[PDB]
Design a protein around this ligand. Structure first.
Ligand SMILES: c1cc2c(cc1C[NH2+]C1CCCC1)OCO2
Lengths: 351, 13
């Protein structure tokens, strides 16, 4: 057969099972008993906006007592208006306070006031994968593979907890001081036993079953991994158009074209991730994530060494010291204003 | 030809 090696991989798969069982036990303790109101706004100096998004912004902040830096996500409760915008916000905070994995950003505090919701996380000063990718054009296949391996492991962890991530893309991936990934922006993540039905995500990364209004499952994350790997290795995503509706027609079609510099191993992996037929999509078959981990394109990947952060990264971001924001783009600043009247108190009771 | 800037995710398409 292909391996002569097979005993090492099998023992390795029993160890994965052992790890995930302990991880589930730890997750459930925190999921059932969530932390709440662990800080307040005047505990932090606000320094600079690091990015914006639905409902507010993420700012670099500095804790006054300790001097530690953090990334504070600020959500304007009055912009979180639609039913699934509200539900998604509660998902994000509850999941983040319960997970623990080397490639997931750590939530350190959360709290709310009359006007806003706040989530305070570790600050990752190396910037977004997005910026680095657009600046250098594309990553070589070994470089893309190193990042992809971390997403594979992160999704194996999340899916084992019945969590779907649903917004994979370079904007959501930060590069830490060792050159490894941190996944942030859990605004679309959800705990799902079975199917879910919300039409949500980013157009370029949507699986066909989402676009087609089907009840869908964690396999949408494996589709999105295919989109991410393609975009990392090409410099642009596989379903690329100016308007969302044009993107959706390309996604559903069952067709994908590859750059001439893609290796055949890479194209084979991508054809099996970017597979419209759910009975054929890698990550969704009887062998689960192992069809991905055992694919030829990953043959050089030491999965355990990646998890243990023993592999030398392809790129280390420049860092000038604590609180350095040089790896982030600039955004317009807007003063935080807290109303004297509690807004939307009943919609965010649980936050 | 397609979008090169940061992409916003949509909560309810
Ligand atoms: C996503 C969701 C948001 C947000 C910002 C984002 C964009 N990514 C962040 C910016 C810095 C890196 C991580 O402000 C409010 O909710």
């Amino acid at each position: 057969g292909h391996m002569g090696a097979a005993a090492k991989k099998g023992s390795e798969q029993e160890s994965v099972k052992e790890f995930l069982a302990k991880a589930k036990e730890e997750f459930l303790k925190k999921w059932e008993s969530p932390s709440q109101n662990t800080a307040q706004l005047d505990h932090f100096d606000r320094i600079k906006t690091l990015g914006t998004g639905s409902f507010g912004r993420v700012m670099l902040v500095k804790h006054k007592e300790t001097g530690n830096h953090y990334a504070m996500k600020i959500l304007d409760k009055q912009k979180v208006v639609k039913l699934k915008q509200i539900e998604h916000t509660l998902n994000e905070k509850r999941i983040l306070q319960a997970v623990n994995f080397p490639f997931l950003v750590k939530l350190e505090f959360s709290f709310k006031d009359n006007s806003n919701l706040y989530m305070v996380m570790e600050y990752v000063p190396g910037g977004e994968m997005f910026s680095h990718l657009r600046r250098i054009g594309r990553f070589s296949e070994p470089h893309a593979r190193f990042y992809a391996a971390q997403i594979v492991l992160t999704f194996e962890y999340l899916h084992s907890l019945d969590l779907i991530y649903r917004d994979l893309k370079p904007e959501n991936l930060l590069i830490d001081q060792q050159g490894y990934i941190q996944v942030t922006d859990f605004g679309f993540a959800k705990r799902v036993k079975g199917r879910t039905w919300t039409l949500c995500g980013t157009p370029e990364y949507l699986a066909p079953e989402i676009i087609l209004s089907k009840g869908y499952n964690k396999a949408v994350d494996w589709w999105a991994l295919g989109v991410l790997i393609y975009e990392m290795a090409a410099g642009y995503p596989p379903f690329f158009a100016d308007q969302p509706i044009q993107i959706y027609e390309k996604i559903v079609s069952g067709k994908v074209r590859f750059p001439s510099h893609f290796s055949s191993d890479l194209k084979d992996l991508l054809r099996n991730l970017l597979q419209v037929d759910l009975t054929k999509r890698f990550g969704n078959l009887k062998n689960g994530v192992n069809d991905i981990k055992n694919h030829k394109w990953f043959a050089t990947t030491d999965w355990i060494a990646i998890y243990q952060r023993k592999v030398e990264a392809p790129f280390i971001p420049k860092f000038k010291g604590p609180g350095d924001t040089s790896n982030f783009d600039d955004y317009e600043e807007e003063e935080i204003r807290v109303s004297i009247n509690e807004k939307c108190g009943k919609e965010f009771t649980e936050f | 030809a397609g979008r090169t800037g940061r992409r916003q995710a949509i909560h309810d398409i």
